[PDB]
Amino acid sequence: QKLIANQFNSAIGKIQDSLSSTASALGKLQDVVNHNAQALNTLVKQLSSKFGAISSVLNDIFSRLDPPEAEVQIDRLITGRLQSLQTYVTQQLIRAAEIRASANLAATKMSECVLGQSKRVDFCGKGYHLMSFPQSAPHGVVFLHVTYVPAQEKNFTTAPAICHDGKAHFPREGVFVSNGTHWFVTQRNFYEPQIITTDNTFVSGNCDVVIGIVNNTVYDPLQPELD
């Protein structure tokens, strides 16, 4: 417990420092802000376009042209600016669809990781997901995914089953490891060897059918009570 708590505290501090120091860690919201700013800028910039008219200032064309001639140029300007606004609206609609997809993903992630424990591989961060914490952002949500990453792996030789008394024994919730010369049962995701017994193994069939079966003893906890 103490080691896990220390690791969690160190990881939280490291996240803090990384967010403080990393130059472009939050690019996925800066991009939205920059896209909105650029869209507004181009919308305003298009206002200065002539669109084939003598001038882009309406008072100028009003002054230097008669109504019959000014009408055509004003129509050109109106069409240009209306088309620019239509393009802006279409781009905003596409960006809104993208943001809606992102928000749906964010809601799903909140539900699965924060309100539960997702069993999906990469949905709540790399490694086996334990829990997640949401953090508010100006235009989004930041998820801190706590995950269990195995480390310091050691190699052991294994067999699929153990033959004892002419019967094949399989591990109930573990794997068989040999430790060179002594067979044990250990959980898959953590090394905790245990003696092979009838409690942690189940029997099915003879040893003639299983490929790779090995000879070893299975200890019966009731055997000692001979009297």
């Binding site: 969690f8 930041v142 998820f143 995914h145 195995p150 792996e153 794997v175 995701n189 790779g212």
Partner: protein, 76 residues
């Protein structure tokens, strides 16, 4: 400028020197070619997909973790 010329599937690249070893992609050019600033001059190289290692697969060998490192990662 014509100081150095290199032909790439994306086009002709001028001002960058092709190096015969791979790094991580800094500035993507195309067709697997990436450019970066290294000890200084701009260099061009084929991007490296990552470290290569062979899993010690065997008929009766298994690896089990003897420790763990619970880690927290950020998603935005």
């Amino acid at each position: 400028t014509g100081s150095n010329v290199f032909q790439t599937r994306a086009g002709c690249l001028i001002g960058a020197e092709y190096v015969n070893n791979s790094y991580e992609c800094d500035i993507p050019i195309g067709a697997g070619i990436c450019a970066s600033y290294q000890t200084q001059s701009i260099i061009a190289y084929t991007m490296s997909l990552g470290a290569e290692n062979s899993v010690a697969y065997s008929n009766n060998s298994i690896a089990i973790p003897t420790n763990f490192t619970i880690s927290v990662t950020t998603e935005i």
